[PDB]
Design a protein around this ligand. Structure first.
Ligand code: OQQ
Ligand code: OQQ
Ligand code: ZN
Ligand code: ZN
Lengths: 356, 356
């Protein structure tokens, strides 16, 4: 029987690592992409804490048997802590040391966030943090990070108080500190003193751009414990994933494939394409020449173009299936190239072709 | 090797029949449901002549290899002749003995309709007819029907002039005459004198209601050749199908399953349900208790409700898959009950439960 949580590193190349997380409900191969659940297959999917806590509500999900039973998925599920989405989407918010109140009006605190994730039944639980807006001054970035670290300790204590959760799930802490090296170090130190099963890099993919994101990752990821998984939240494009793995990231949440699939964009080894464009109306090639997915084995760019231009649901479903398959082929190629000692060459080849 | 076209009747109960159509690309079990292609599985699908002739155009479909290659379907395809949809959907129309002009502006004639269906490559080709509006006076119904019969002869001649079509496809004639027995008889006689591979009942499902539709079928279907298939165009609900089979119909076009699937309606043996309704938010049963489809084996009403309320494409795709599967289980139960001599009892049991 698998353990509650065990991360093993099988091979390394530079700062890049490949290995496995073992949990009770399954093995997660890393580096991993984690797609939304409602979308070589994925080993773990994302639940949507913010949506579920409002419709149908976390209590109701528990009454229906938990999220695994509800969505018919018996493998690992990761949930975020909800504050990022509250701050991004809800209309009015009130912040305090207790938590965040938002509009029926609601309070989300470290304790309530952990209880919601418990009622949902997720396997990887995120601490309740504040994603500092960008740009931030040093003083505001520090105050925000300090609150998040106090909230990280409250998250730890709440998780440990619920036996079913402490014994069967895992808890990840989230590093903050905006773009400042000294604050990222203080945050890493605070999280390691509390102790978590894994460590996320928060506060990025918030408008800073790839060059700046990579600069911050360069000094931030080495601050986290080497022997635990590293999750970069909110990222991203295929080229962001490749560069983040080069900098020591093990886990990625990938909304973009499903978002792109419903809006006419397909990922290919030669870059993204907009299938609605008239240049695809007579193109008999599959979406991607090398893709092994079921769409590309059977149907042409010209037919998928026809369906999407016609407003047919089938068109968006085929695009989304392809995009998910593309991402899991990307991650498999990354894992294999690290294990074989040729990831540096893969990254160079990938970029030359994706951007050609 | 299968023939171009061969209809055999294997069993009969009252006016109901069950059997097979053999064509070069496959066998069609009757009574048959024929779903849209762009949606025990279906044996034949519908192409959309009106849409395809405008986007990308019939010539372009031929340049891409024909509709079978284009949509990745190597089995039989039926196409309508296009005039019904022109008259229903296009903004301005001009009618004459030559054909119909409509808005770039276009002319559709018997000869052009047959050529378009040839370029698309369909296996069952419909004659170019006029679907008389309802209600119609006897004089207007007669004039319209007479034009359609002149157009049926022109359709026959155009089809026979194209060797690839005459040797590999089949041509169906369409009966008109509104709700009038004497005109339905004249139309049947004209079509049989020309000679077709199959015979459709046109001019119904245009606002007359089920009672009147069944009354017209009662005297119209016996006028058609018994030894050829009978296609009721534009029908319909499950209860319409059962009653039409009781009256001698062999073939049905079924848009409703895909339309309902995208608009929140699921078919069940206990009648249709509106999955968005709040009464399904905690319902752990599958869409239908007896359905063998993949959706009903895996997911609950509560989860499909959640997805559709959230605007997720997955929700409509699951509803549509279920609805298609429901229709092909309906047709299989009809075929089996006729072959076993218990179709009368099936129809009674079906109605008692569907309308309970
Ligand atoms: C887009 N940029 C970004 N997203 C970020 C997220 C959200 C992660 C998430 C939440 C929900 C889903 C769901 F679709 F499945 F619902 C998917 C992904 C962050 N989350 C937390 N907790 N701290 C952060 O500092 C942080 C930074 C983030 N930058
Ligand atoms: C809805 N009522 C109705 N539909 C009727 C139709 C259209 C059949 C059709 C066409 C295209 C498709 C597509 F979705 F696949 F594109 C699906 C079905 C008729 N067609 C002709 N030729 N004569 C008629 O007298 C007639 C009567 C009809 N009553
Ligand atoms: Zn593909
Ligand atoms: Zn079903």
């Amino acid at each position: 029987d698998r353990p509650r949580f065990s991360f093993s590193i099988a091979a390394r190349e530079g700062k890049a690592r490949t290995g496995t997380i073992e949990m009770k409900r399954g093995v997660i191969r890393t580096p991993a992409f984690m797609p939304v659940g409602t979308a070589t297959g994925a080993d773990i999917i994302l639940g949507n804490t913010y949506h579920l806590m409002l419709r149908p509500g976390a209590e109701r999900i528990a009454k229906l048997g938990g999220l695994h039973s509800f969505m018919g998925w018996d493998r690992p599920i990761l949930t975020d802590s909800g504050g990022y989405q509250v701050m991004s989407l809800s209309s009015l918010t009130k912040q305090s040391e207790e938590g965040v109140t938002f509009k029926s009006r609601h309070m989300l605190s470290p304790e309530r966030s952990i209880e919601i994730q418990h009622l949902l039944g997720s396997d990887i639980v995120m601490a309740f943090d504040e994603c500092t807006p960008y740009p931030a001054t040093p003083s505001r970035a520090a105050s925000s990070m300090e609150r998040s670290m106090r909230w990280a300790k409250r998250s730890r204590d709440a998780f440990d108080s619920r036996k079913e959760q402490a014994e069967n799930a895992a808890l990840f802490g989230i590093q903050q500190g905006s773009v400042f090296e000294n604050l990222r170090q203080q945050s890493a130190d605070a999280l390691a003193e509390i102790g978590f099963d894994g460590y996320a890099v928060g506060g990025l993919a918030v408008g800073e751009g790839q060059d700046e994101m990579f600069r911050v990752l360069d000094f931030s990821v080495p601050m986290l414990p080497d022997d635990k998984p590293h999750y970069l939240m909110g990222v991203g494009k295929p080229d962001d994933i490749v560069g983040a793995v080069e900098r020591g990231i093990d886990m990625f949440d990938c909304v973009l494939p499903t978002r792109s699939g419903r809006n006419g964009q397909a990922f290919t080894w030669d870059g993204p394409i907009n299938i609605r464009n008239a240049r695809f109306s007579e193109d008999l090639k599959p979406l991607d020449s090398e893709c092994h997915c079921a769409v590309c084995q059977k149907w042409s760019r010209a037919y998928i173009h026809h369906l999407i231009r016609a407003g047919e649901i089938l068109g968006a479903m085929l695009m989304t299936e392809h995009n998910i398959a593309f991402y899991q082929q990307l991650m498999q190629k990354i894992r294999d190239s690290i294990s074989e000692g040729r990831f540096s060459q893969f990254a160079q080849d990938f970029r030359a072709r994706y951007f050609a």
